[PDB]
Structure formats: C-alpha cells, structure tokens
C-alpha cells in the first residue's frame, strides 16, 4: 500500500507489492483520444496496434517478455510485462521501441498490414458490440464539438485516410517527456527501477510541450441509431457528471452504487436491495442495466445503460428508473446510503487490488498524471464512510434535479419516447 514517486528529469512512479510473481514496466502519456482532431482521430489506436505488431512483439517474446497497451480519452499507455528478475530487459525494449525503432516500426509493409487490421477491428466493433457502440456514441453527442466526443478506437473515415506522417506528427507532439510518466508495478522497488533509469541519460525533445485547445462542455442532446433488425434495444442515458479531482468524485460514485447493476438471469441479482427492482421485475422491463459515474480530466458522465427485449414497455423502464433517481434529491434513506458504502468499498477494492500488475500500471500512471500523486485505498475508504444523506441530497439537487440529459441508443428503439418526455421526468410536481 505504498505510493512512491520521484522526479529527476523524468517523473518516475512505482507501487511495490512483494508477493507478485511478475512485474510490469512502461510509460504512460498524459494525452489520449481527447487530444486528437476529427480528422486524425484514431492515431493513438494505430500506435498501440503497431507497438503490438507481429514484428515488435516477436522481439520481446524471444526475450521472454509480454506486451500490453491501452488507449483512453485522457491518457495512453505502453507496458511490458516480465519476471521479477528481468526488470531491466524491459527497460531496454522500452527505449529500443521509443527512440531507436521509432522509424523501424513505421515501414511501408508493417503500417499497411497493421492499418488493415484496425480497419477490420473498428468495423467489427460498430457492426456487433452494441452496448459499447452506444456508450461511445453517448460521449459523442454529450460532448459534441469538444474533446471528449472523439471515440477512442477512431472513426473508419479518419482511419482509412491516415498516413505514417500523421503518426510521426502526433508522436512528436505528445510522446514528449513533460507529458509522460514511467510506471513500475509488480514487486520491484522504487529505488531498484529509478537507478536503471537515471543510468541512461539523453532527454530526446526536452522543453517541448503539447498543443492546447478549448475546454470540454456538456450539451443536452441525443443520437438515435434505430435499427429494427436487431433483436434488442440498447440505450444509455446520463447527465453531466464529475471530473477526476472534484470534491464530489465519491458522492457521485456512491450515488451510482445505490442503483448499481442488474442481470435478470442471475438469481442473486434479482434479490439485491435496490428499490427499482420491485418496479422492473413485474413485467420484466429489461435483461440488464448498470449505473456509472465516469470521470475524466475536464468533465464526466453520471447515468446508466440498459438492454431490453420488451420493446413495447421501454417508456416504463425509463420512467421508473428516472423516478428512482428523483429520490436522491428528496427521499433517499440512511440504509440505502449505507448499503452503497459497503458495496463501493468492495468494488473499489477489487479494482485497485487484483492479481494483475498491468491494471495497476495503468491506474498508477493515469492518476499521477492528473493529480501529481495517487490516493491510497485506505484514504479513499475514510472519505467514502464520511458521506451523509445530506451530501447525496445536495449533490443530486445540483446534478440530477431538472437538469439536461444526453441519450443514445440502437436497435428496436421505436418505443423510446421523445426527448422532452424523458427530460420532464428529471423532476416531480409539488405544492
């Protein structure tokens, strides 16, 4: 449970955990899809794909190393996993690919074979992964004409028109030092890694900063992707949430836990202590749903997602759910808040502490990049337990009560009523 981080030339961050069996090293950049443009959208996803290409991947495999990378909105990360002993051979492969081979990975035979893969990849996504496709579109309309609206995997149109020069252009503007953090998780010590790094000098484009832009903003709107040939209806709905490093980051995350997630087929799920289940189970209004409090640097999204085959009662699904959310402003109970506290701790635990160093790396790098440090799991619990009913009520009265929303859906959505109908349910009549 130690968050160690020191700066010499490069800001090095590590979180050691003795019993681990393995160790992971890599760099995480403070720039992701939210830094691209509508036309070069998909560059970051492309980088990730070449970094994992058959050529580069075969080199580290001989050495007994494994590769992993993830593209997000605010950040990007390249990671190399290894045994606790080869904690040095990872640092060689890292520098070899980001300085020496930052021109060998971009050959006219590799880039074309990779481009052909992300194209079949992103296409496959839009053709079949409906729930994620919808959540991606939710960000698209909620933050339109603003950074957060750009899909992480990029659009098929900005992708097929992307050239090697664009990769370089992006890389030379974001893969800088002042916008980077070298992460090390697994078992290796902070002082073990920091030495192998402060050994090899060379700055490589120092003093350079990435370009700036215009702040992200929420806009009440919707995008309806009707498709009557699909067998279900997938919809996502949300209000403007909380950004990371916000006084209410936790109240919000707790508020989502109150309604939580559900799966109509799993017996135990049907028994949960969520009032909403009394309303939706009578006529079986949906196969599943899940609330969330997504947070980013400039903004966030608080809402839920759901999938259903009861295409003639979608208005009741949406109506009941939004009536429950009304309660957070006027009648949420102590026991509901308490049930949430326990469950939030359990999930926040399983995330920050799993048996996989790669997840730890991403989380560590991402956090240190936005707030210059990581909040310890124990420090979180103290904040979570401190939340009162009054807090939830004040938060909801600001974020949920009579506030614009964003909607997105695909499939048999004829039954999803108009905007103003849904919008009206964000409140209740009173004397």
């Amino acid at each position: 449970a130690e968050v160690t981080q020191l700066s010499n030339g490069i800001v090095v961050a590590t979180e050691h955990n003795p019993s681990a069996h393995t160790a992971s090293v890599g760099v995480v950049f403070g720039s992701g899809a939210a830094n691209e443009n509508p036309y070069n959208n998909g560059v970051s996803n492309l980088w990730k794909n070449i970094f994992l290409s058959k050529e580069n991947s075969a080199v580290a495999a001989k050495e007994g190393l494994a590769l992993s990378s993830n593209i997000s909105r605010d950040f990007q990360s390249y990671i190399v996993s290894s045994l606790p002993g080869s904690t040095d051979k990872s640092l060689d492969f890292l520098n070899q690919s980001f300085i020496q081979q930052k021109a060998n990975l971009l050959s006219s035979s590799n880039f074309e074979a990779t481009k052909k893969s992300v194209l079949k990849q992103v296409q496959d996504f839009e053709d079949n992964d409906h729930p994620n496709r919808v959540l991606e579109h939710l960000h698209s309309t909620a933050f339109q004409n603003t950074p957060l609206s750009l899909p992480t995997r990029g659009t098929l149109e900005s992708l097929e028109n992307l050239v090697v020069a664009d990769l370089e252009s992006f890389a030379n503007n974001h893969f800088l030092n002042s916008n980077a953090v070298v992460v090390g998780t697994g078992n290796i010590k902070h002082e073990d890694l920091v030495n192998s790094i402060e050994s090899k000098n060379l700055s490589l484009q120092t003093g350079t900063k990435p370009v700036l832009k215009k702040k992200a903003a929420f806009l009440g709107s919707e995008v309806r992707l009707r498709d009557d040939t699909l067998p279900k209806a997938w919809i996502s709905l949300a209000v403007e949430g909380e950004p990371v490093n916000s006084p209410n980051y936790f109240v919000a995350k707790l508020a989502a836990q109150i309604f939580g997630s559900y799966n109509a087929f799993e017996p135990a799920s049907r028994l949960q202590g969520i009032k909403l289940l009394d309303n939706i189970q009578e006529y079986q209004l949906c196969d599943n749903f899940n609330h969330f409090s997504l947070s980013y640097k400039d903004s966030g999204l608080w809402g839920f997602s759901t999938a259903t085959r009861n295409v003639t009662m979608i208005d009741d699904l949406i109506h009941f759910t939004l009536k429950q959310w009304n309660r957070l402003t006027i009648s949420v109970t102590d026991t509901e808040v308490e049930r949430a506290k326990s469950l939030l701790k359990l999930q926040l635990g399983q995330l920050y502490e799993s048996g996989n160093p790669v997840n730890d790396a991403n989380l560590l790098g991402a956090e240190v990049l936005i707030k210059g440090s990581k909040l310890s799991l124990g420090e979180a619990f103290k904040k979570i337990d401190a939340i009162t009913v009054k807090d939830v009520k004040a938060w909801a009265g600001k974020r949920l009560w009579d506030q614009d929303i964003a909607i997105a859906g695909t499939g048999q959505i004829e039954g999803l009523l108009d905007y103003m109908r849904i919008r009206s349910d964000m409140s209740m009549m009173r004397w």
Partner: protein, 62 residues
C-alpha cells in the same frame, strides 16, 4: 458519413455565457400563463355561481 460526426447546430445553439437563460424565460412564461389562467378560471366560476343568487327583481323590501 460517420455517425460520430454530429451535424451542425450552430444556428440554433445559444452561445452559453448565461447557461440558465432559456430556462429563466421559459419558466417565467409558463408561470405567467399559470397566473393569468387561474385568475380567469376564478372569474369564470364566480360568474356562473353568482348567476344563481337572488335576481334584481326579487329583492323587494316589504
């Protein structure tokens, strides 16, 4: 075209410097409509009811 590229709404959108601008106007409008409607309903109801009170020709003081 890509569904992620949201069409232009610039002509319709209000340059948000005052977020609660349209809300204040709409709510005032609805409120004034409710005010005048209630006054009218009250006057109409009173008009019908008072038509059942004693007529001018029967209030003779014997």
């Amino acid at each position: 075209k890509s569904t992620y590229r949201t069409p232009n709404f610039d002509d319709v959108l209000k340059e948000n410097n005052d977020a609660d601008k349209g809300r204040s106007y709409a709510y005032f409008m609805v409120g004034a409509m409710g005010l005048l409607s209630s006054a009218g309903a009250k006057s109409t109801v009173e008009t019908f009811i008072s038509s059942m009170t004693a007529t001018a020709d029967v209030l003779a003081m014997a």
